[PDB]
Curated annotation (Swiss-Prot):
Cellular component terms per the entry's GO annotation: cytoplasm; cytosol; nucleoplasm; nucleus
Protein name: N-lysine methyltransferase SMYD2
Biological processes per GO annotation: heart development; negative regulation of cell population proliferation; negative regulation of transcription by RNA polymerase II; peptidyl-lysine dimethylation; peptidyl-lysine monomethylation; regulation of DNA damage response, signal transduction by p53 class mediator; regulation of signal transduction by p53 class mediator
Alphabetized SMART domains for the sequence: SET
A Pfam entry, by short name: zf-MYND
Quaternary structure and interacting proteins, as annotated: Interacts with RNA polymerase II and HELZ. Interacts with SIN3A and HDAC1. Interacts (via MYND-type zinc finger) with EPB41L3. Interacts (via SET domain) with p53/TP53. Interacts with RB1 and HSP90AA1.
Residues noted as binding Zn(2+) 2 in the record, renumbered to the chain: C63, C66, H84, C88
Positions that bind Zn(2+) 1: C50, C53, C72, C76
GO MF, any single term: protein-lysine N-methyltransferase activity
Localization: Cytoplasm, Cytosol; Nucleus
Amino acid sequence: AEGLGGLERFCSPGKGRGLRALQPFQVGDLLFSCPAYAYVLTVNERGNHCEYCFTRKEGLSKCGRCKQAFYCNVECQKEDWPMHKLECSPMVVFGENWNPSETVRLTARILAKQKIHPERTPSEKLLAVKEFESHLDKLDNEKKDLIQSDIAALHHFYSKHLGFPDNDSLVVLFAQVNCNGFTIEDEELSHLGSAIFPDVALMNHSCCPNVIVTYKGTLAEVRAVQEIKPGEEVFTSYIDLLYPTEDRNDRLRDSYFFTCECQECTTKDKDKAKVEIRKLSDPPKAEAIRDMVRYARNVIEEFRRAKHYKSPSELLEICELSQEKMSSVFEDSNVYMLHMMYQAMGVCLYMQDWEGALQYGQKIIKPYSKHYPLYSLNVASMWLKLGRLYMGLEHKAAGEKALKKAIAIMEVAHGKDHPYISEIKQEI
Ligand SMILES: O=C1COc2c(cccc2[C@@H](O)CNCCN(C(=O)CCNCCc2ccc(Cl)c(Cl)c2)C2CCCCC2)N1
Ligand SMILES: C[S@@+](CC[C@H](N)C(=O)[O-])C[C@H]1O[C@@H](n2cnc3c(N)ncnc32)[C@H](O)[C@@H]1O
Ligand SMILES: [Zn+2]
Ligand SMILES: [Zn+2]
Ligand SMILES: [Zn+2]
């Protein structure tokens, strides 16, 4: 049996619904593939990727009216039109004032797909969009205010062609988009867009995941990173595994209303190395260390919101200033130091400072390999960033070693026949 035939929908105790294997799955094996029910490309990736198939290309056929949407050919342009029509005219009319969030952009595509294709889609083999968990009973004022702001934005930019249901039905739908929604990312883990994969959304969370979700354009591919036996539950990671048990569970309680009780969460085995303190002769107080963790956590959240409006020169300054204050107590291997080093590397890449970005990457990779589990995409993308930075700076010996190390992880996660692997092999 293959695809969703060798797997089944079942009730996981204390987790609601879940997916379990009916056949053995080895490391690297493709469990199932799921096409996108609805998908949307991020504004910052326009001109680099096709709006319909997400294929990265140089020189795409741009839209005549708006000149914002880019396509492979007339076929990609015509096929994306039922979804693009909701944005083409408003982009010309509103101009700089056209600013709907990616959540609003995607929810509009779901409402359009629910109209065009009301019957069951190939994306809904085991779980349907109408059957999705919303956590309406658990929703607080903070979330309801954000959902209401999104509903108001949906009415402001998409009410020309889309007939909306009652406010309470939209509250449930937006909550379902947050609970079951995915973000399509490339080989370098750069944000490409947002999508809905109902069959993939059936899998529960674990900090020790047995599977990984990679993308082949708009198609999500689920591959094993651990040995799965028949009857075993299929688990994926909903969050970045670099952070300790506290930081991990605070995000899971805030975004998905649950507390993870897996092996890494129970034992808290990696927490010590993650929040590593320097070996000082005159160390700060236990309360002073707690203050720096609080500062670092607030600096990460402030950078998250500042990223979308502040200039790269300002963003690089917060990365540098935070690192200097944290470096007085925290080690270079510390996860809070690594985040600001990663963000500074990202800023350096936008500013096209290759030597600057390489300096950070060389300090990030060794603690990254230690903190992250085996076959992690964050480690794979870091080797991929280093390799491409070494190759570009004519250090072809160091590049070849890093790109091969990225391939070694990606052959299990993306599969040996993935187009990304073929590109990296051609770069060598
Ligand atoms: O089925 C899944 C999906 O989750 C997975 C699964 C597997 C692997 C990885 C991930 C995740 O990493 C994917 N994350 C995607 C990003 N995403 C969010 O984080 C939304 C949460 N909002 C944060 C707080 C918040 C919670 C609830 C409410 Cl109601 C409100 Cl208002 C706010 C959005 C998606 C839709 C477009 C906007 C972004 N398995
Ligand atoms: C995207 S849905 C996963 C499918 C869901 N279990 C269903 O009913 O179809 C995520 C929700 O599943 C639950 N969940 C996932 N992993 C869990 C875990 N390890 N422990 C407890 N609940 C979990 C939470 O309620 C979370 O909001
Ligand atoms: Zn295309
Ligand atoms: Zn257009
Ligand atoms: Zn856990």
